[PDB]
Amino acid sequence: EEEDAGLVAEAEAVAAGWMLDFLCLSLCRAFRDGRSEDFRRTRNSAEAIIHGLSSLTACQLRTIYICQFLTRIAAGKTLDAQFENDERITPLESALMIWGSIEKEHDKLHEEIQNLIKIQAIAVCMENGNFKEAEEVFERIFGMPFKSKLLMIISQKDTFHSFFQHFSYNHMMEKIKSYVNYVLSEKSSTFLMKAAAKVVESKR
Template sequence: MAEDASSTALSPRGCADGKDADPAEELKAERRKDDQEQFECQEQLECKMQVGTLEEEEEEEEEGSPGAVAAGWMLDFLCLSLCRAFCDGRCEDFRRTRDSAEDAQFESDERITPLESALMIWASIDKKHDKLHEDIQNLIKIQAIAVCMENGNFKEAEEVFERIFDEPNSDTPLKRKLLMIISKKDTFHSIFQHFSYSHMMEKIKSYVNSVLNEKSSTFLMKAATKVVESKRTRTATTQDNSNDTEMETEANVDIGKRFVWVWEEDNNLRSGVKKYGEGNWSKILLHYKFNNRTSVMLKDRWRTMKKLHLASSDSKD
C-alpha cells in the first residue's frame, strides 16, 4: 500500500491526465517554492555584498596599495619601452616587450580589418585633438581602403569605407575623394602614392616621439636612473679613494725617508748642543746642516737620543 501511495503521489502541477493536484501537496510545493526563492534571494544578496566588498577592496588597492602603484609603474615602463622600440625600428624588442605587457587583440568581428581595429584604438587615445593626431587618423583611413584595393577586394573596400565613414554628417573632402576612387576602382590613384603606408608610419613615429618627450621622466625610469648614477658615483668614489690611498702610501714612504735621522744629523745635533747648549734649537738649526728639520724636530730628536743614551751631553730638558 505504501508503495502504491508513493507511486501514485500527485505532482504539484497535477497529473499527466489533467487531474488537479492534491491541495495539501500544492501547499507543500508552494512552501518549497517560497523557501527556494528566499534561498536564491539570500544567495544573490550575499553575492552582491561580496562583489561590493571586492570592488571596495580593489578600489582601496588602486588608491593605496604599494603593489598597485608598482604595477602601474611597470606598465608605464613597458609602454615607454614599446614606444622607444617602435621609434628605433627594433622589431624584435618591440614584440618581446609587447608580449610582456599583453597580447595584441583585434576585433572579434572577422569583417573588421587590422587597420580598422587600429583606427578604433587610435580614436580612443585622442585627448588633445591636435593636428598630428588627426592627420594620422586620416592616413589610417586611407590605408585601410588602399590595402583592400591593392588586393583587388573592391567590395571589401566599399564595406570598410561604409564602416569608417558611418556618421551621416561626416561629408568631408576626404570622404568624397575616397568614395570617387572606390567607385572608379582606381587602385593607383595619386592619393595612395602621396599618403603612403611609409608616410603613415613616419607620422606615427613623430607622434610617439612627442609622447616620449612628454612622458620620458616616468617614476620607474627616474628611479632606475638614480640607481645607475648612484652606482657610478660609488665606483668613481672607490677609485678615487684607491688612488688617494696609493698617493698617501707613496707620500708616507717619502715622508718616512725624508724624516729618518741619519748619523750626520745626530752628530751635528750633539755638536750643536755641546756648543750652544740644550734649548737653543734655532741657533743650532742655523749653524749646522740638517735635512729639512725644524726646531721642534731637533728638540724631539734630542729627547729621543737621551732616552736611547745616544747623547754625549748631560744636559736636561
C-alpha cells in the first residue's frame, strides 16, 4: 500500500523523463523548420511537463537549457517579453546567458553564435527607436575593434546600418539552426520517438 504508491511515483518520473526528451526533439525540429505555431504549442507542453518533474539528471538539465535558449531566440524581437526577474534583461540577453551556461564544446560555431547574438541584442533595440536601451544592453554585454564600432553606431543612432546586414538576424538564425541540426540527430534515438517511429514504419 505504502510501497505501491512509491513504485507508481518512480514509474511516473521515468515516463516524465521520456516525455521531456521527446518534447525537446519536437521543439528543435519546429525551430529548424520554422513551424512557429507548432513551436508555441510544443513549448507549452514542455513547460507543463517540466513543472511535474522534481529530480533532474545533468543531461535533462542540458535538455531544458536547450528548450529555454530556443524559446528566448524565437522571442528575440519581442522586447516586451520578460524572461528574468530583472525586468531590464532583454530576450537575446537572456539567450546569451543560457548559451554560456550549457555544458557544451566551445567550438568555432559556439563563438560565432555568441557574437551574432551580442550584435543582434543591440540591433533589435536600435530598430525600434530604443537608442538609450541599446547603450544599456551594450554596457551589460561588453564590459575593442567591434566594441568601438558598435558604440559609434549607437551614438550615431543609425538603426539601418550596413554592419547589422552583414551580421544580420537571419545569419544568427541560420547559424543557430545548424547547431539545432546536431541536437536533432542526437535526440532522434530517444525512447518515445524511437518506439513511435517503429509503430509508423510497421504500418507502411
